[PDB]
């Protein structure tokens, strides 16, 4: 149900105080919601989009030079002045010759001379911004229950198509068949704009920081020019040849695209073509979960004689889906689905697709549950009719909860203190934690910030030196926090 | 209560020179800004505006910048309109449009609202 | 150094029409100096908006406003035969000028 092949799950559970969890969600990760009712639902951000653009400066990539005149005088006489210095199209320098007799001026001595040559661009990087408000997330809330092919496609209509604005609130979803949800989002702390530029070159974007791209050595022009013919810092595109001691000349420095490619190792590629579509960053999510109905009651149990179609067939992490076929009863009904130990005793493993239901007979209804680790026996339908299937989940143990710590600490790397969501209420914790994550991560960015890959693994190693032969136990001050969470997040960057 | 008047103009030769005048009633002089639009017959609402003040210092216009000056009086309460070098297609309906001048004296941004009242118009013809 | 509204729109009375006015990102892209006139054929163009979204007092509340970047629209739900008259748009450049629009002729039969 278009969360299922994703690589990235994130099983949220728990919706207690009232009846809300907060969830927080990237583009390229979807979530699974699961409570003892109200049944299961799958979340995912598909496009950010940023509405109107104003854009602030207009970097040049690739420029010419023509109509190159030069002028020199002779020396102690002062420096030469020329007509077209007067424009600020024309870039100039005023440099040393020597002069003699055989230049045609005497008192052989070294003059000064000058060169103008106008400078016009022929490609443009211009870089837009956007205020935090009029832009729109969108989120698909597709829910359980699968019907046939509808799985992981992401094409195809079964998902709630609401969207997200900052002017908006609530935000109403009236999913059919099952109730009402309603999110109140959180669009404007998400991104953090007002520092992200969305710089366009000739057909790809990017999405940079903002002081990176003020002080971009280019000849650049502010974003309310026309006609463009004032650019400014000039003389980062041009350059002047005086070899020897004789007549100099300007020539053209070269187009700067592929080292612009060079400048941007580290920069999220966005699509500004027929729209400023994002598809980079998150969104906090409050999930209110008051209204929702199972879609099942009021069915009558079925009658047996189910059929399997497609295997049972475990996709990434023990979430098997297994589809099966019904033949024969009042056609709307529900599912005798369980799943047992060998002895058919302790209803071991749980049920993810909650409440499964057959629906228009003659048409496959596929089912999502996650075995205990081991040997279980996926059973469907009653006695005269039964299929009892074997499955072993490959034998997993203690492991699992440290591959939930490689998640969970992989999901701090990239989400610095919005990473202590998942959790609902969590008070006296929660709270806690994201308060000195804020005043630990707050320290760590703006002072630790600017360096590589490799630096932070060699800082890392100096503090974890200086503190390992350090003494009166403030080893674990600078080890257990600065050392090898910074060789941590050494390993980790450049995602 | 506030109401503005104009001055019109039969016909004119070009070659000439045009003063179209403008009674202001109901405020002050002082504080009020006081433009001036075009309207030719059938065609877009042209801009000949003055930002006049209780000083007179006065941005000319951009098309018009170096073709025409105007003048003024606080005790007549009455701004001018010296349309020199007249042409065949500088025949218009000429409006004075009172606008607000900034409490510091000086006019350096225009209010929220422009044009809350207006004259009746002056259709000068050349000939 | 002008603005760019349509020459001439209509509608029946009862229906809402939109008129629309394209300008630079120096007077309208940036700014929120975007004004509505009501140029009667026998009278003085009349103001019948302030700023985007506002308008004078006298004008009733059918008028109404609004600015998705470069582009200023207008919209008048609710036509009636009292609207068969041209409306100039209006914009304050960063320049320091003012520009108008062409104009557009409303219709309702």
């Known amino acids: 149900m278009r969360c299922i092949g994703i690589s990235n799950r994130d099983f949220v559970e728990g919706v207690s105080g009232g009846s809300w969890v907060d969830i927080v969600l990237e583009h390229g990760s979807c979530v699974t919601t699961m409570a003892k009712n109200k049944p299961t639902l799958d979340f995912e951000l598909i496009e950010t989009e940023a509405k109107q653009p104003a854009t602030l400066r207009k970097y040049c990539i690739e420029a010419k030079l023509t109509n190159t005149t030069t002028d020199s005088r002779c020396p102690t006489q002062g420096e030469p002045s020329l007509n077209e210095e007067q424009d600020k199209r024309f870039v100039c320098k005023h440099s040393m010759v020597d002069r003699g007799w055989g230049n045609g001026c005497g008192l052989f001595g070294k003059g000064g001379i000058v060169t103008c040559a106008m400078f016009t661009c022929k490609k443009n990087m211009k870089g837009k911004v956007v205020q935090p408000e009029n832009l729109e997330y969108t989120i698909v809330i597709t829910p359980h229950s699968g019907e046939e092919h509808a799985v992981g496609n992401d094409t195809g209509k079964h998902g709630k198509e609401i969207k997200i604005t900052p002017q908006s609130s609530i935000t109403e979803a009236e999913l059919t068949g099952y109730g009402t949800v309603t999110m109140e989002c959180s669009p404007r702390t998400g991104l953090d704009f007002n520092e992200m530029v969305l710089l366009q070159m000739e057909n790809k974007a990017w999405l940079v920081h903002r002081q990176w791209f003020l002080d971009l050595p280019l000849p650049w022009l502010p974003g309310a020019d026309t006609q463009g013919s004032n650019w400014i810092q000039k003389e980062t595109l041009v350059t002047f040849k005086n070899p020897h001691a004789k007549k100099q000349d300007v020539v053209v420095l070269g187009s700067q695209e592929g080292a612009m490619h060079t400048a941007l190792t580290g920069a999220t590629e966005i699509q500004m073509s027929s729209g400023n579509l994002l598809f980079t960053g998150h969104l906090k999510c409050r999930l209110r979960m008051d209204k929702l109905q199972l879609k099942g009651m009021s069915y009558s149990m079925c009658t047996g004689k189910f059929k399997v179609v497609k295997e049972i067939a475990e996709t990434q992490h023990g979430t098997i889906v297994i589809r099966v076929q019904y033949e024969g009863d009042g056609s709307p009904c529900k599912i005798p689905f369980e799943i047992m130990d060998l002895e058919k005793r302790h209803v071991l493993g749980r049920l993810i697709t909650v409440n499964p239901i057959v629906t228009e007979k003659d048409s496959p209804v596929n089912i999502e549950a996650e075995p205990p680790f081991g040997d279980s026996y996926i059973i469907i339908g009653v006695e005269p009719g039964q299929l009892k299937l074997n499955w072993f989940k490959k034998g997993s143990s203690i492991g699992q909860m440290i591959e939930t710590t490689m998640r969970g600490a992989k999901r701090m790397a990239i989400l610095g203190d919005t990473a202590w969501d998942f959790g609902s209420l969590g008070g006296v914790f929660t709270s806690i934690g994201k308060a000195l994550h804020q005043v630990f991560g707050a320290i760590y960015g703006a002072a630790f910030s600017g360096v590589s890959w490799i630096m932070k693994i060699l800082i890392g190693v100096i503090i974890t030196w200086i503190g390992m032969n350090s003494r009166s136990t403030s080893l674990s001050v600078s080890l257990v926090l600065v050392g090898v969470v910074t060789l941590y997040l050494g390993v980790m960057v450049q995602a | 209560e506030v109401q503005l008047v104009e001055s019109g103009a039969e016909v004119k030769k070009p070659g000439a020179s045009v003063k179209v005048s403008c009674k202001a009633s109901?405020?002050?002089?002082?504080?009020?800004?006081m433009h001036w639009v075009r309207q030719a017959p059938g065609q877009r609402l042209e801009w000949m505006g003055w930002?006049?003040?209780?000083?007179?210092?006065?941005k000319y216009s951009q098309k018009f910048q170096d073709r025409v000056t105007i003048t003024r009086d606080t005790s007549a309460s009455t701004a001018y309109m010296e349309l020199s070098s007249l042409r065949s297609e500088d025949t218009a309906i000429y409006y004075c449009a009172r606008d607000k001048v900034d409490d510091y004296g000086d006019y350096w941004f225009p209010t929220l609202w422009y044009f809350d009242y207006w004259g009746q118009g002056t259709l000068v013809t050349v000939s | 150094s002008a603005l760019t509204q349509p020459a001439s729109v209509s509608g029946s009375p009862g229906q809402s029409i939109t008129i629309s006015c394209t300008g630079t990102?120096?007077?309208?892209?940036?700014?929120?100096?975007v004004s509505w006139f009501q140029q009667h054929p026998g009278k003085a163009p009349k103001l019948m908006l302030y700023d985007v979204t506002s308008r004078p007092s006298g004008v009733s509340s059918r008028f109404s406003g609004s600015k998705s970047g470069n582009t200023a629209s207008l919209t008048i739900s609710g036509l009636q035969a009292e609207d068969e008259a041209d409306y100039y748009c209006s914009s304050h450049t960063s320049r320091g000028t003012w520009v108008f629009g062409g104009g557009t002729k409303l219709t309702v039969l």
């Open positions: 930002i006049n003040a209780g000083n007179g210092n006065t």
């Open positions: 990102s120096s007077d309208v892209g940036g700014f929120n100096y």
């Open positions: 109901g405020y002050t002089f002082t504080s009020y800004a």
